Amino acid sequence: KIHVNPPAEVSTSLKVYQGHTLEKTYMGEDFFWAITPIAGDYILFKFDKPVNVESYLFHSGNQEHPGDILLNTTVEVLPFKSEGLEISKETKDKRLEDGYFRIGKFENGVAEGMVDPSLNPISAFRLSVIQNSAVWAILNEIHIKKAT
Structure with missing residues (x-):
């Protein structure tokens, strides 16, 4: 699908297969195709x-x-703001050492979800591969929707 995502610098550690780069998927042009994520x-x-x-x-x-x-x-x-924001105990539990919050994960090939209003506005989205994959990974659709 074609969405207008927020203007971004997009990158990956993954090796892509035959031109199937992340920037084209972000732009709606083609699917991302990574070799066996680790x-x-x-x-x-x-x-x-x-x-x-x-x-x-x-x-x-x-x-x-x-x-x-x-x-x-x-x-x-x-989050854009590193301090100057009350957040709940539940949300603090999702904070990583590098200051990213873990809000969701892939379940049967899909990740979709809301962003806690207390974390907005956001500077970066990251998808972290936690464990080795046997399969190549396609990303066919990326939609980051604005609240405002």
Whole structure:
């Protein structure tokens, strides 16, 4: 699908297969196709400006290769403000050492979810590969939706 995502510098540690780069998927042009993701691989969307994020949608696999999905991969967000924000005990528990919050993860090839209003606006979205994959990973759709 084609969405207008917030302007961003987009990068990955992953090796892509035959031109299937992350920037084209972010732009709606083609699907991302990574060779066998390993623990500690990431996909990074670093926004040019802070974004008030309502929700996110990542769909892995596609019609032609439906088992080429993202497994054991988390959804992490970097708040623009590092301090000056009360957050709940539950939300503090999701804070990583590098200051990203772990808000979600891939379940049967899909990650979709709301952003806690207390974390907005956001400077970056990251997808962290926590464990090794046997399968290649397609990203067919990326939608980061603005709340404002």
